[PDB]
């Protein structure tokens, strides 16, 4: 709940989740290897 921790732990979630899509996008859309 502390604005810094909680605030960062909250953004850390979507940033990771969204930093994950590139792996679900690349390794799925261009896995021609």
UniProtKB/Swiss-Prot annotation:
Coiled-coil region: none
Localization annotation: Virion; Host nucleus; Host extracellular space
Post-translational modification: Phosphorylated on several residues by host. These phosphorylations regulate VPR activity for the nuclear import of the HIV-1 pre-integration complex.
Entry's transmembrane regions: none
Residues with the Phosphoserine modification: 30
Family: Belongs to the HIV-1 VPR protein family.
Subunit structure: Homooligomer, may form homodimer. Interacts with p6-gag region of the Pr55 Gag precursor protein through a (Leu-X-X)4 motif near the C-terminus of the P6gag protein. Interacts with host UNG. May interact with host RAD23A/HHR23A. Interacts with host VPRBP/DCAF1, leading to hijack the CUL4A-RBX1-DDB1-DCAF1/VPRBP complex, mediating ubiquitination of host proteins such as TERT and ZGPAT and arrest of the cell cycle in G2 phase.
Function, as annotated: During virus replication, may deplete host UNG protein, and incude G2-M cell cycle arrest. Acts by targeting specific host proteins for degradation by the 26S proteasome, through association with the cellular CUL4A-DDB1 E3 ligase complex by direct interaction with host VPRPB/DCAF-1. Cell cycle arrest reportedly occurs within hours of infection and is not blocked by antiviral agents, suggesting that it is initiated by the VPR carried into the virion. Additionally, VPR induces apoptosis in a cell cycle dependent manner suggesting that these two effects are mechanistically linked.
Comment field (misc): HIV-1 lineages are divided in three main groups, M (for Major), O (for Outlier), and N (for New, or Non-M, Non-O). The vast majority of strains found worldwide belong to the group M. Group O seems to be endemic to and largely confined to Cameroon and neighboring countries in West Central Africa, where these viruses represent a small minority of HIV-1 strains. The group N is represented by a limited number of isolates from Cameroonian persons. The group M is further subdivided in 9 clades or subtypes (A to D, F to H, J and K).
Protein name, per record: Protein Vpr
Organism: Human immunodeficiency virus type 1 group M subtype B (isolate NY5) (HIV-1)
Complete-protein stretch covered: 50 to 82 of 96
């Amino acid at each position: 709940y502390g604005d810094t921790w909680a605030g960062v732990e909250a953004i850390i979630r979507i940033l990771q989740q969204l930093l994950f899509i590139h792996f679900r996008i690349g390794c799925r859309h261009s896995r021609i290897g």
